[PDB]
Amino acid sequence: TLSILVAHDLQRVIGFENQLPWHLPNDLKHVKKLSTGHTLVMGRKTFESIGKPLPNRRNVVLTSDTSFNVEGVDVIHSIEDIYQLPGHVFIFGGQTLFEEMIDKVDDMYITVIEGKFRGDTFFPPYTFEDWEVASSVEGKLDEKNTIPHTFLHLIRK
Ligand SMILES: NC(=O)c1ccc[n+]([C@@H]2O[C@H](COP(=O)([O-])OP(=O)(O)OC[C@H]3O[C@@H](n4cnc5c(N)ncnc54)[C@H](OP(=O)(O)O)[C@@H]3O)[C@@H](O)[C@H]2O)c1
Ligand SMILES: Cc1cc2nc(-c3nccs3)n(-c3cc4nc(N)nc(N)c4cc3Cl)c2cc1C
């Protein structure tokens, strides 16, 4: 299976200045739970944003940099390389990766952040005519998680 994981706001903002525009611990937990024991593929900028590979899954970084060789990270230099990775593969960001892969993935696990943030990077437009709503679950709000959010699982029709 090849899936996208993304958190985007009401206007499909995904990032600002190489970080998330929002603080939402529950999204991080969501992503951790879904990808445990699986594979994440991310662009070079996203990797540098997190700074270190996420433990307990295979971290794959897509970059043109042939000098890239980081401990705990596997490197690829082509989109085509993604299709050679075994198991459940998650496209992990950022904008460039999402743009390159949205037409290729089986499904998408989206955290819709139900707000309007300042962004400099976006998830590409998509239509529910192309995607079946496998599930839609409202996120619980509390002291640590104060922005309304919805977890969508979309499967390509
Ligand atoms: N809300 C979310 O779900 C989420 C998730 C992840 C990231 N983000 C946000 O997304 C933003 C980053 O997105 P971005 O588009 O600027 O960067 P990005 O997609 O993370 O990384 C872009 C880099 O990936 C490499 N790359 C992409 N396609 C390639 C290809 N076909 N062949 C070789 N290398 C390739 C290049 O690295 P080189 O220049 O080294 O060659 C490119 O500069 C940040 O704001 C971040 O916070 C949001
Ligand atoms: C501990 C932790 C730290 C994180 N930092 C980040 C950053 N994202 C952008 C810049 S830095 N994330 C992320 C959260 C994500 N959430 C969803 N829904 N989908 C994605 N593709 C995500 C990707 C990342 Cl890197 C993180 C996810 C976790 C679990």
mmCIF file of C-alpha atoms and ligand atoms in Angstrom:
data_model
loop_
_atom_site.group_PDB
_atom_site.id
_atom_site.type_symbol
_atom_site.label_atom_id
_atom_site.label_comp_id
_atom_site.label_asym_id
_atom_site.label_seq_id
_atom_site.Cartn_x
_atom_site.Cartn_y
_atom_site.Cartn_z
ATOM 1 C CA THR A 1 0.000 0.000 0.000
ATOM 2 C CA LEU A 2 1.082 3.549 -0.856
ATOM 3 C CA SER A 3 -0.644 6.221 1.232
ATOM 4 C CA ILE A 4 -0.390 9.954 1.863
ATOM 5 C CA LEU A 5 -0.317 11.289 5.414
ATOM 6 C CA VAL A 6 -1.056 15.022 5.674
ATOM 7 C CA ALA A 7 -2.409 17.676 8.035
ATOM 8 C CA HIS A 8 -3.917 20.610 6.135
ATOM 9 C CA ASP A 9 -6.124 23.533 7.132
ATOM 10 C CA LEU A 10 -9.411 24.813 5.621
ATOM 11 C CA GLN A 11 -7.470 26.364 2.725
ATOM 12 C CA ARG A 12 -5.018 23.436 2.416
ATOM 13 C CA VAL A 13 -2.122 25.207 4.144
ATOM 14 C CA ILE A 14 0.435 22.613 5.336
ATOM 15 C CA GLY A 15 3.433 24.691 6.471
ATOM 16 C CA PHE A 16 5.006 28.032 7.231
ATOM 17 C CA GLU A 17 8.741 28.738 7.356
ATOM 18 C CA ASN A 18 9.566 25.012 7.300
ATOM 19 C CA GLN A 19 7.407 24.165 10.316
ATOM 20 C CA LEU A 20 3.774 23.341 11.086
ATOM 21 C CA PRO A 21 1.616 26.476 11.436
ATOM 22 C CA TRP A 22 -0.282 24.889 14.373
ATOM 23 C CA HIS A 23 0.421 23.171 17.674
ATOM 24 C CA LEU A 24 -1.678 19.996 17.741
ATOM 25 C CA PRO A 25 -0.191 17.130 19.814
ATOM 26 C CA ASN A 26 -3.041 14.807 18.776
ATOM 27 C CA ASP A 27 -2.021 15.004 15.103
ATOM 28 C CA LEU A 28 1.501 13.940 16.013
ATOM 29 C CA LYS A 29 0.050 11.034 18.025
ATOM 30 C CA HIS A 30 -2.220 10.130 15.073
ATOM 31 C CA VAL A 31 0.737 9.990 12.667
ATOM 32 C CA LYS A 32 2.845 8.009 15.153
ATOM 33 C CA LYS A 33 0.072 5.422 15.595
ATOM 34 C CA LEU A 34 -0.646 5.007 11.857
ATOM 35 C CA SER A 35 2.994 4.652 10.744
ATOM 36 C CA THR A 36 4.492 2.521 13.564
ATOM 37 C CA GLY A 37 6.441 -0.365 12.016
ATOM 38 C CA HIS A 38 5.928 1.040 8.500
ATOM 39 C CA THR A 39 7.822 3.313 6.078
ATOM 40 C CA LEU A 40 7.833 7.106 5.771
ATOM 41 C CA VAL A 41 9.066 8.845 2.619
ATOM 42 C CA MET A 42 9.779 12.561 2.998
ATOM 43 C CA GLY A 43 11.460 15.385 1.095
ATOM 44 C CA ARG A 44 14.792 16.793 2.241
ATOM 45 C CA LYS A 45 13.241 19.972 3.719
ATOM 46 C CA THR A 46 10.732 18.003 5.828
ATOM 47 C CA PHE A 47 13.559 15.847 7.118
ATOM 48 C CA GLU A 48 15.616 18.884 8.120
ATOM 49 C CA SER A 49 12.498 20.299 9.834
ATOM 50 C CA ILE A 50 12.147 17.262 12.114
ATOM 51 C CA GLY A 51 15.962 17.089 12.461
ATOM 52 C CA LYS A 52 16.206 13.351 13.226
ATOM 53 C CA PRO A 53 14.466 10.184 11.945
ATOM 54 C CA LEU A 54 11.324 9.118 13.808
ATOM 55 C CA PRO A 55 12.043 5.952 15.864
ATOM 56 C CA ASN A 56 10.343 2.589 15.212
ATOM 57 C CA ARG A 57 9.734 3.035 11.482
ATOM 58 C CA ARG A 58 11.826 3.182 8.319
ATOM 59 C CA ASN A 59 12.686 6.801 7.484
ATOM 60 C CA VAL A 60 13.365 7.422 3.795
ATOM 61 C CA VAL A 61 14.514 10.828 2.528
ATOM 62 C CA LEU A 62 14.198 11.957 -1.092
ATOM 63 C CA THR A 63 16.966 14.383 -2.101
ATOM 64 C CA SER A 64 19.204 15.215 -5.082
ATOM 65 C CA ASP A 65 22.123 15.536 -2.625
ATOM 66 C CA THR A 66 24.522 12.642 -3.289
ATOM 67 C CA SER A 67 26.424 13.637 -0.144
ATOM 68 C CA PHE A 68 23.335 12.835 1.957
ATOM 69 C CA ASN A 69 24.127 9.899 4.248
ATOM 70 C CA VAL A 70 22.489 10.260 7.657
ATOM 71 C CA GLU A 71 22.458 7.608 10.420
ATOM 72 C CA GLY A 72 19.033 5.949 10.841
ATOM 73 C CA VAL A 73 17.861 7.279 7.464
ATOM 74 C CA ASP A 74 17.702 5.617 4.045
ATOM 75 C CA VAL A 75 18.185 7.914 1.067
ATOM 76 C CA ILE A 76 16.605 7.857 -2.391
ATOM 77 C CA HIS A 77 17.249 10.174 -5.349
ATOM 78 C CA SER A 78 14.231 9.483 -7.578
ATOM 79 C CA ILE A 79 10.441 9.311 -7.274
ATOM 80 C CA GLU A 80 10.747 5.935 -9.028
ATOM 81 C CA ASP A 81 12.723 4.573 -6.043
ATOM 82 C CA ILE A 82 9.582 4.870 -3.853
ATOM 83 C CA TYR A 83 7.903 2.021 -5.771
ATOM 84 C CA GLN A 84 10.760 -0.350 -4.797
ATOM 85 C CA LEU A 85 10.186 0.090 -1.044
ATOM 86 C CA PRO A 86 8.421 -2.913 0.569
ATOM 87 C CA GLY A 87 5.435 -2.878 2.941
ATOM 88 C CA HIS A 88 3.072 -0.025 3.723
ATOM 89 C CA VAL A 89 4.695 3.196 2.494
ATOM 90 C CA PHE A 90 3.480 6.620 3.681
ATOM 91 C CA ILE A 91 4.201 9.795 1.730
ATOM 92 C CA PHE A 92 5.102 12.100 4.631
ATOM 93 C CA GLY A 93 5.604 15.493 2.921
ATOM 94 C CA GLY A 94 6.213 18.145 2.172
ATOM 95 C CA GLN A 95 4.480 20.200 -0.529
ATOM 96 C CA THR A 96 6.786 19.025 -3.314
ATOM 97 C CA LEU A 97 6.353 15.338 -2.395
ATOM 98 C CA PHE A 98 2.579 15.711 -2.076
ATOM 99 C CA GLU A 99 2.376 17.377 -5.501
ATOM 100 C CA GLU A 100 4.444 14.582 -7.059
ATOM 101 C CA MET A 101 2.506 11.729 -5.406
ATOM 102 C CA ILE A 102 -1.172 12.713 -5.036
ATOM 103 C CA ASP A 103 -2.022 11.174 -8.442
ATOM 104 C CA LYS A 104 -0.163 7.953 -7.537
ATOM 105 C CA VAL A 105 -1.269 6.966 -4.009
ATOM 106 C CA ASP A 106 -3.963 4.412 -3.101
ATOM 107 C CA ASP A 107 -5.398 6.448 -0.248
ATOM 108 C CA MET A 108 -4.893 9.439 2.015
ATOM 109 C CA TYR A 109 -4.981 9.859 5.785
ATOM 110 C CA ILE A 110 -5.764 13.528 6.250
ATOM 111 C CA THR A 111 -5.999 15.569 9.402
ATOM 112 C CA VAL A 112 -8.228 18.498 8.440
ATOM 113 C CA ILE A 113 -7.270 21.386 10.707
ATOM 114 C CA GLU A 114 -10.537 23.308 10.943
ATOM 115 C CA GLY A 115 -8.972 26.770 10.965
ATOM 116 C CA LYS A 116 -7.356 29.341 8.677
ATOM 117 C CA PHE A 117 -3.601 29.759 9.170
ATOM 118 C CA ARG A 118 -0.850 31.768 7.463
ATOM 119 C CA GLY A 119 0.993 29.374 5.155
ATOM 120 C CA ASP A 120 3.740 29.343 2.560
ATOM 121 C CA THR A 121 3.225 25.738 1.468
ATOM 122 C CA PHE A 122 0.037 23.892 0.458
ATOM 123 C CA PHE A 123 -1.461 20.474 -0.159
ATOM 124 C CA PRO A 124 -2.665 20.268 -3.797
ATOM 125 C CA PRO A 125 -6.414 20.654 -4.528
ATOM 126 C CA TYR A 126 -8.441 17.448 -4.617
ATOM 127 C CA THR A 127 -12.121 16.632 -5.075
ATOM 128 C CA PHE A 128 -14.414 14.227 -3.196
ATOM 129 C CA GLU A 129 -15.646 13.102 -6.628
ATOM 130 C CA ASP A 130 -12.365 11.162 -6.834
ATOM 131 C CA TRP A 131 -12.166 9.962 -3.215
ATOM 132 C CA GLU A 132 -14.467 7.848 -1.076
ATOM 133 C CA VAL A 133 -14.701 8.760 2.604
ATOM 134 C CA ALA A 134 -13.644 5.493 4.268
ATOM 135 C CA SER A 135 -13.953 7.220 7.653
ATOM 136 C CA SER A 136 -14.312 10.676 9.174
ATOM 137 C CA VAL A 137 -13.672 11.102 12.889
ATOM 138 C CA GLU A 138 -13.855 14.347 14.832
ATOM 139 C CA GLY A 139 -10.782 14.980 16.970
ATOM 140 C CA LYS A 140 -11.287 15.458 20.686
ATOM 141 C CA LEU A 141 -10.467 18.865 22.098
ATOM 142 C CA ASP A 142 -8.868 19.461 25.478
ATOM 143 C CA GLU A 143 -6.284 21.697 27.168
ATOM 144 C CA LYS A 144 -3.415 20.461 24.967
ATOM 145 C CA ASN A 145 -5.472 20.279 21.737
ATOM 146 C CA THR A 146 -7.545 23.392 21.140
ATOM 147 C CA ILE A 147 -7.984 23.594 17.346
ATOM 148 C CA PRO A 148 -10.936 21.607 15.934
ATOM 149 C CA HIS A 149 -9.738 18.849 13.633
ATOM 150 C CA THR A 150 -11.109 15.877 11.735
ATOM 151 C CA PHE A 151 -9.302 12.676 10.773
ATOM 152 C CA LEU A 152 -10.298 11.620 7.251
ATOM 153 C CA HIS A 153 -9.381 8.404 5.530
ATOM 154 C CA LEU A 154 -9.943 8.815 1.781
ATOM 155 C CA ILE A 155 -9.653 5.980 -0.736
ATOM 156 C CA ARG A 156 -9.290 6.630 -4.479
ATOM 157 C CA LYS A 157 -12.489 5.704 -6.349
HETATM 158 N N1 LIG B 1 1.143 19.619 7.427
HETATM 159 C C1 LIG B 1 1.834 18.552 7.000
HETATM 160 O O1 LIG B 1 1.213 17.335 6.821
HETATM 161 C C2 LIG B 1 3.279 18.623 6.631
HETATM 162 C C3 LIG B 1 4.063 17.464 6.494
HETATM 163 C C4 LIG B 1 5.396 17.579 6.054
HETATM 164 C C5 LIG B 1 5.912 18.832 5.741
HETATM 165 N N2 LIG B 1 5.116 19.946 5.892
HETATM 166 C C6 LIG B 1 5.599 21.286 5.557
HETATM 167 O O2 LIG B 1 5.905 21.297 4.174
HETATM 168 C C7 LIG B 1 6.869 22.318 3.943
HETATM 169 C C8 LIG B 1 8.013 21.711 3.141
HETATM 170 O O3 LIG B 1 7.583 21.392 1.830
HETATM 171 P P1 LIG B 1 8.587 21.680 0.595
HETATM 172 O O4 LIG B 1 7.898 21.331 -0.666
HETATM 173 O O5 LIG B 1 9.172 23.025 0.761
HETATM 174 O O6 LIG B 1 9.770 20.632 0.842
HETATM 175 P P2 LIG B 1 9.856 19.028 0.891
HETATM 176 O O7 LIG B 1 8.865 18.433 -0.021
HETATM 177 O O8 LIG B 1 9.826 18.529 2.281
HETATM 178 O O9 LIG B 1 11.344 18.790 0.322
HETATM 179 C C9 LIG B 1 11.685 19.323 -0.934
HETATM 180 C C10 LIG B 1 13.008 18.687 -1.298
HETATM 181 O O10 LIG B 1 12.801 17.304 -1.523
HETATM 182 C C11 LIG B 1 13.671 16.857 -2.539
HETATM 183 N N3 LIG B 1 12.907 16.303 -3.669
HETATM 184 C C12 LIG B 1 11.553 16.386 -3.915
HETATM 185 N N4 LIG B 1 11.287 15.713 -5.062
HETATM 186 C C13 LIG B 1 12.452 15.203 -5.542
HETATM 187 C C14 LIG B 1 12.780 14.435 -6.659
HETATM 188 N N5 LIG B 1 11.844 14.057 -7.523
HETATM 189 N N6 LIG B 1 14.096 14.062 -6.875
HETATM 190 C C15 LIG B 1 15.091 14.429 -5.992
HETATM 191 N N7 LIG B 1 14.762 15.187 -4.886
HETATM 192 C C16 LIG B 1 13.473 15.566 -4.670
HETATM 193 C C17 LIG B 1 14.531 18.051 -2.929
HETATM 194 O O11 LIG B 1 15.639 18.021 -2.060
HETATM 195 P P3 LIG B 1 17.049 18.676 -2.469
HETATM 196 O O12 LIG B 1 16.891 20.163 -2.669
HETATM 197 O O13 LIG B 1 17.994 18.368 -1.326
HETATM 198 O O14 LIG B 1 17.478 17.990 -3.748
HETATM 199 C C18 LIG B 1 13.607 19.205 -2.589
HETATM 200 O O15 LIG B 1 14.256 20.452 -2.436
HETATM 201 C C19 LIG B 1 7.333 22.806 5.315
HETATM 202 O O16 LIG B 1 6.682 24.010 5.659
HETATM 203 C C20 LIG B 1 6.876 21.716 6.262
HETATM 204 O O17 LIG B 1 6.613 22.184 7.567
HETATM 205 C C21 LIG B 1 3.822 19.852 6.309
HETATM 206 C C1 LIG B 2 7.080 13.871 17.077
HETATM 207 C C2 LIG B 2 6.651 14.453 15.750
HETATM 208 C C3 LIG B 2 7.193 15.668 15.310
HETATM 209 C C4 LIG B 2 6.799 16.213 14.079
HETATM 210 N N1 LIG B 2 7.156 17.347 13.409
HETATM 211 C C5 LIG B 2 6.433 17.343 12.261
HETATM 212 C C6 LIG B 2 6.585 18.420 11.253
HETATM 213 N N2 LIG B 2 5.781 18.595 10.193
HETATM 214 C C7 LIG B 2 6.212 19.644 9.416
HETATM 215 C C8 LIG B 2 7.379 20.298 9.824
HETATM 216 S S1 LIG B 2 7.927 19.515 11.271
HETATM 217 N N3 LIG B 2 5.624 16.284 12.154
HETATM 218 C C9 LIG B 2 4.802 15.885 11.153
HETATM 219 C C10 LIG B 2 3.409 15.749 11.299
HETATM 220 C C11 LIG B 2 2.594 15.265 10.268
HETATM 221 N N4 LIG B 2 1.250 15.166 10.427
HETATM 222 C C12 LIG B 2 0.458 14.680 9.436
HETATM 223 N N5 LIG B 2 -0.876 14.586 9.682
HETATM 224 N N6 LIG B 2 0.948 14.288 8.232
HETATM 225 C C13 LIG B 2 2.265 14.356 7.930
HETATM 226 N N7 LIG B 2 2.736 13.990 6.726
HETATM 227 C C14 LIG B 2 3.186 14.865 8.979
HETATM 228 C C15 LIG B 2 4.561 14.964 8.783
HETATM 229 C C16 LIG B 2 5.339 15.452 9.831
HETATM 230 CL CL1 LIG B 2 7.100 15.577 9.549
HETATM 231 C C17 LIG B 2 5.803 15.486 13.227
HETATM 232 C C18 LIG B 2 5.257 14.269 13.672
HETATM 233 C C19 LIG B 2 5.655 13.729 14.905
HETATM 234 C C20 LIG B 2 5.069 12.418 15.382
#
